[PDB]
Symmetry: D3
Subunit: 309 residues, 6 copies
């Protein structure tokens, strides 16, 4: 898929732009927004075509809110605002956002330039609330120094885990994406030993090998984020997390972003993480990282997105 919007299954990139906007209530504002997103291939190609490789992509997400202002008579089975969470020790907020632009490419400039054009073409119809500049950190690691994205599904597995299928035929090819902008306590995480961090995560640090069944804490991030139903079948998400940061504000982030054909799966994950399972037995990763955003979007197929207004 070269320079098509709503390409959910694109592999990891060296650079990322995550843009979250809220729209004006204005019916002008709402129509401008609809011109821009419904013709998103326009700027995508306009920018992306300028690089031989065509690495640029752009997934547009529409919040449950704004989706209702533009398509009253039609709705995907699982679209809703982000379910906030209140656990024993840690809390997942549910912040504002109508529009998500998930931009990826082999270079920063291509990313930013597409962002410049999307923002410029929306003028006053929308306002940027969250902006993360994602980046690859060494051999695909988060700023906690672990290889990040290892166990994502691929090929058919990824398509099945992430894209709306027969189960909701009106919106085939779409997805539900949840973002959370985590900031990290670097000095705290650094007081742990490698082995403790490995215990927290679920896998060895340098070698990125998953720990044995008998060495794996019942509250390792891995165990918490593994989902098996009654019949014995696993359910996966597709994560496109990037690192970001600012040195003189001491921010060191993991930008979480997970796509799934049904947000139930992501949501259960988030519950097992914040509330724990057994309850109270929560995800130790949360000790070292706090969510500062939390938002859910529907990712329309190319067709659905092209008809809006």
């Amino acid at each position: 898929a070269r320079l098509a919007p709503q390409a959910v299954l694109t592999p990891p990139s060296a650079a990322s732009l995550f843009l979250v906007l809220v729209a004006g209530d204005s019916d002008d504002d709402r129509a401008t927004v609809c011109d821009v997103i419904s013709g998103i291939d326009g700027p995508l190609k306009a920018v992306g075509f300028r690089e031989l490789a065509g690495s640029l992509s752009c997934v547009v997400g529409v919040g449950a809110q704004f989706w209702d202002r533009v398509s009253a008579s039609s709705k995907p089975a699982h679209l809703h605002p982000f379910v906030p969470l209140s656990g024993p020790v840690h809390s997942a907020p549910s912040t504002p956002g109508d529009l998500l632009f998930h931009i990826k490419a082999a270079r920063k400039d291509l990313c930013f330039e597409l962002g410049r054009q999307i923002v410029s073409a929306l003028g006053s119809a929308a306002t940027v609330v969250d902006e993360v500049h994602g980046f690859r950190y060494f051999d695909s690691r988060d700023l906690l120094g672990f290889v990040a994205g290892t166990e994502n599904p691929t090929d058919d597995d990824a398509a099945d885990s992430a894209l709306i299928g027969d189960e909701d035929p009106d919106f085939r090819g779409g997805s539900y994406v949840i973002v959370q902008k985590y900031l990290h306590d670097m000095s705290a995480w650094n007081t742990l030993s490698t082995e403790e961090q490995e215990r927290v995560i679920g896998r060895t640090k340098l070698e990125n090998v998953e720990l044995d069944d008998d060495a794996q804490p019942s509250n390792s991030h891995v165990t918490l984020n593994t989902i098996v139903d009654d019949d014995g079948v696993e359910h996966d998400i597709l994560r496109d997390n990037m690192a970001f940061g600012s040195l003189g504000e001491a921010e060191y982030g993991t930008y979480f972003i997970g796509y799934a054909k049904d947000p139930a799966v992501t949501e259960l994950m988030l519950r097992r993480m914040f509330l724990g399972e057994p309850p109270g037995n929560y995800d130790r990763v949360l000790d070292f990282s706090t969510a500062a955003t939390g938002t859910l979007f529907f990712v329309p197929s190319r067709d659905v997105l092209e008809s809006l207004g």
Copy 2:
């Protein structure tokens, strides 16, 4: 589609070679031509395999006259010679050619070497009448200075536009391709201002953005080459244009090469360009660009190409 002939859908490349030949009148000549072209996979792999990336591609096209010499009793539905056009100041001549080899690669040497092996296999059975060595010019710009190919369709839309379908099943997967070798008047074009040049084209020069509707001349290249039928269905073509030129002979060129499932679309675009819409409202790009060739070829699918003889 790695090292397969008739890969119409290949993304743009850094180098290309376009060869147009005329076949000898003889029965020998016809048979040699058929062997070489029906067996084009041989040279394709012989050269292309030597590069790890396998970037080399080769699309063979056959003119209407030569087709009738070779397969009298089976003809793709829309194969006819190039339709010349004559406006009051600018014309599209119809120039000879029985064979097109449209060759693309990441490097010159690959395109050249394949050309050599093809020309050599053809020996005296065919004669080159046009030869153009295409090259990528900065960030996918043409010699007029504009990003070039921005609006080409990709993925499914590309297949939908370029490749014969249910309409003409005996040749599904083939295409119709048109070439025109345009030379530019750089002087005249340079005496325009950027803002005028943009008005000629239909997009901003540097940033490659489409001009919005109320700033968009009715005889802009973009506008004139937009094809919406009465039912409001858009009809696209697939363009693999490349810069080319010679400093000593002051040639600065654009090699037009457009693929379509039905050449009616390409031909309509052309008639809107040369004869204007409404009539006399011609494409100002033609004030600065003069076509020296105009030839139409049928691009058979692999199975059809392999059967020839």
Copy 3:
């Protein structure tokens, strides 16, 4: 096909690792091997995910004997051990192997690391019996100096040639791989003129152009390995050969590895090469190449592999 096990159709790579292993006798050995190979995408992702490009792949093969030790319930239609061949001048031995890991990547480190992890996780449950580190040699050449892999099928022809289909649907998506480690007699090869070598292979050397029909000897490698059935349809295999060797031992090698949906095609190529067509008209490439191994494996699809 990013970071998936059993990706038979991957394009060529700069580096590869061919690992052949024998499994231990015990039921415990059986289970450790089965546990490792069934979860192969674990290590495959553990190392592969670390390279932006995602070039790393890993095809697992299972030999007939070991397949029987895990699944006498159903067998791929053509799975059997490798058939030795004993020709008038040269022979192709049949040699042990229970498991094959055919690993490809853009970098040696990735192949090596994935191997390290696989070999480690198998521990005493298995023994490496052959190991060769392949590498690309100039413009896709082999150590004999010829461009090597030119006429592989690609795209659909590749899938039609290599992947088991309707003809054996319980194992749809798998394949049959045959491997042979060849060592060359370099001085003997260099006593030939370029023209003689071209007549041996059946293509020109520098340019890699097929010799035409009447300059083509009947015993050219290319002729002997052309398989056309009674209806005129050609049957192709998919070869992922790499160069290897060792300067100190004077080993200059071609690692042959050929995938096919029906290994009789590959086997018939072998018979025509070793015994000749007509008999005695054997492949003169064999006058400069001696095969030190010979092993056949079934390549389960992801589904069947995951269930093992």
Copy 4:
């Protein structure tokens, strides 16, 4: 020069980190700072070595201020705080900074990681005041869409323009660097025509050709920034400007950073720019860009830097 600090003459990079810090008054603070900078090759190599190419570099700059707290008995001929400017229309501030880290590399991660380690190793001894993440924007352009850095000197020319020579023998191999973090008025600049912008700058936009003597405004950025002494000899700086920005804050920047063997040259340039020459005839670029920082640093040779404390 692979992985050596104070490598002033390294060619352009795809990524940049500009860090400006101020030090604590604390004599601990001052000694920590001196350990970190005097052993700067330590973290440079620690990070840089991890990339085969070794693209990472780091120039340390020491403000005139702090330089005096650490080397009382020795001073470079032209070290002083940044001379602020007050012109007819526009003003160049002179902001705080003791330490400059000019970091460059082929990737973001390498940049940031070196920054992480420099900041972490300074702990509370210093505080980040300015942090710019530089990036390459297309074919070496600033966010004003012009090719940026064209006329820099190279080879010997660059060494002579930038490195302290015979004229101040104690500090041979060092440099004076001035930074200014400009923000741009994008909507204003976009109301000009290409030709007007060309007039402002001095060179053609797309083609990056310098205008003819007779077409060149006496107040084009180029003319203002050309320096010729009494004898007829030119004097050049070496600029390593990068683009940066933030979309939802509408910041679009040129991070200016010029090295010279004598800041007189940079300073005269800045005067001709802000005050004009003839006076009042100032640099039109200033209409569309405002300096939000202004700081001057001495760049010690490797030897001088290694002995500090």
Copy 5:
């Protein structure tokens, strides 16, 4: 040596452009040419700065006649027009050229753009008389199939070979370039066996290994082009040859371009090639290659060029 004019010592590149021009008669022509060439680093930076890598280079050469039209005050010690050679079978013509632009870059677009700019800025003051777009061919080969440039001197030997020194200090840092556009007779070359071609060149074809002393013919290109003085010291030139051609015209070419601090070395190679050593023992490469141009230029250092 990033984006500087007169960088003779640049390594090989994927693409090059060779432009030969004649200047107009008028004094106005003289001044426009001089203005353009003296400011050559303007366009060189205007296009070159646009590529991150900075691969673009541009060497300017000035012919003897035009040099005289601008500087009869001082002449490089060896500057004279190219000497035609008329041998027993083959001849090297002397053909017009007042200016040479030898442009190299990693990409065609850069070479082309710099040429566009140069040719434009010269307008009617000059005329392009020869233009060839060179390209790398496989693993540094020429269209005859041999690796081409193997024995160029490098590093210091390169500077010692190519750059004018103490022997003519008013022009320290310059050089002398000779260019000849050769066209090959491909069918004739292909009637030779590989062994015959190797004996012509003096190296093996695929492997690019020098033939040893007793398999080396006396009229091998390599032998004829070895220049050893009476004290035993070898004298080398620096060649930046590229392939070119046109499929429709059947032109398959080698663009010869040789730099030396003293062009008698290059000239003596030419005489030994065209007339033979001993006489009549000429270079059999010339039985397959015909030179269509022949021109000598002085390559001013940056300083002398800037002052023109």
Copy 6:
């Protein structure tokens, strides 16, 4: 230093080949050896020229015994056989070799092909006694998992450390090189914890940071291999180590290869490693690493190498 033999200063590469040979006893053997090695530029270019980047390099080294057979009456000042060491549990054996070819390239095939041509030119006049195919392992790490070569000197410092100077003018520009082929006990090493492994080495594992003084064991690899003379002058060596190994034979290796103007420095480092400082305080890396070879070679400059015979 493009395609020149004896380029000791080459930056690290992705592939290498180390060959150690013993010369035949004969006069023929000696003369063949001298021809091949004095003419090594031939094979170097023959192979290396075929790659555009020209990454291929080849450094020839000559052992003390063979040197004395070849140039009896002229000997670099410090050429002697490798000095064996025997600690109580760990030893450095002294193993045969008259010739070293240290070959580096960006690709395996280049290193291999050069090796072939060299081994073939030598024929029966020499026999390979050690052959190692080095490869870059992730981000310049060795098989123990640590970034490896971090502290090598670069630029002038490298030249200063590695290359014979005024001390021994007849051989200025040469060097002395020592090789040791170490095999690791991966099991034993893996039973350590990261923090212990770091203590063994002297730097953090993942982030490659030097441990500060008060956390830095006196028998850390780093500490023991730091060489300060009485005058406080540091003495460095240049290391081109590479990973290597064989999965079937459970070999996981580090090929040590250190260059020095004076081997006294390398030999002292070694004696501090094997015999400890103070005595018995040995380098714990040796608990996990066992050397199978130990050979010293003189690396002549080009002019000297070319004269041999």
